Amino acid sequence: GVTVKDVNQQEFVRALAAFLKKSGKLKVPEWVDTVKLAKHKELAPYDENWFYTRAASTARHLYLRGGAGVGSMTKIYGGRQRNGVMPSHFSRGSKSVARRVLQALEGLKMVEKDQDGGRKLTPQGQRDLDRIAGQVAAAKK
Amino acid sequence: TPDIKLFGKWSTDDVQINDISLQDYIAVKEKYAKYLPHSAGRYAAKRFRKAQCPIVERLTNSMMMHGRNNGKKLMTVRIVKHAFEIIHLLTGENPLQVLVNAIINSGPREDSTRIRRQAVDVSPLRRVNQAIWLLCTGAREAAFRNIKTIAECLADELINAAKGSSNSYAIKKKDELERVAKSNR
């Protein structure tokens, strides 16, 4: 009886995103390659298939803590913005990426717009992430 | 539990300090055998508590130098770990014996001071301090603007100094200091 908590989280996201690629039911956006992930960043993501990871990462985050809205997702993925000859600061992520990712994980039944705002993990979507932890846990062993 | 071994890989036993002059100022043995080169602290509170700090810890603390990496213990700990790995597979025995031998051969035994300068000998504690200082600064300068990583620069500096080959930076400073001191005698 394994669970997302009990398995290594670093390669858990790698396996969960590859499952989404095999499904082919995510409805990726059309500017996936010409967009920059956040203003504090400097280049486009090196891997072309980042959208499968970004969807996977948010789906993992919604498991640990529910009720995370779009304004939460931009704060979770923010980082240090180097401002030239200015001291660096903290800059939030992009809203559009979070919105389309959350709308992506809702198109197929993985999340739902629960009350009080934000999104939570649906009971059937919870099964999917628990199935992945099964194969990741045994693969290391 | 017995046989506390560094990193869970290197055994602290079978390490022998040949020079009795610095025996009590190098902490390798059973009372100071720890799984990690990381420790809480409280070693600078009094004058001689420094000698009860494990020697591998004292080397890690001598690697957070030159501004860019003050107070970065995690990066320094992993540097020593990788350096100890490649000292073993390049020399063939426990790196603790390599590090200890370098300390013995690198700490200068005589210096000069303003009292024209007079030649005075060095106390055992400062001999340890100078050794760790010299061994680390050699690795730092050998890795700056160079392709090879900081880990192997630290590895060969310990290896070269242990054999006393004179091609290491630490030894080139020791004989310099002892040759100047002799001329000031």
Binding site: - | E85, L89, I147, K148, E152
Partner: protein, 75 residues
């Protein structure tokens, strides 16, 4: 005051070279490999990876800042 001219891809004079004595080094690392063969750092990483698969060098440690290789045990 000195300039390094490191190639990016093996010549046929060079690929056959590191299949002879590189699997015989005690210490194998992209940094040390680069300076003996005068090749780019990335080139050594890609080459040392292929030799790893063939089983002629065994991996002892792997970190984002350094990967370390040894040679196969004698006999």
């Amino acid at each position: 005051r000195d300039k390094l001219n490191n190639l990016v891809l093996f010549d046929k004079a060079t690929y056959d070279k590191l299949c002879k004595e590189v699997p015989n080094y005690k210490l194998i690392t992209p940094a040390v490999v680069s300076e003996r063969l005068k090749i780019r750092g990335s080139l050594a990483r890609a080459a040392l990876q292929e030799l790893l698969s063939k089983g002629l060098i065994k991996l002892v440690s792997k970190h984002r800042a350094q990967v370390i290789y040894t040679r196969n045990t004698k006999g």
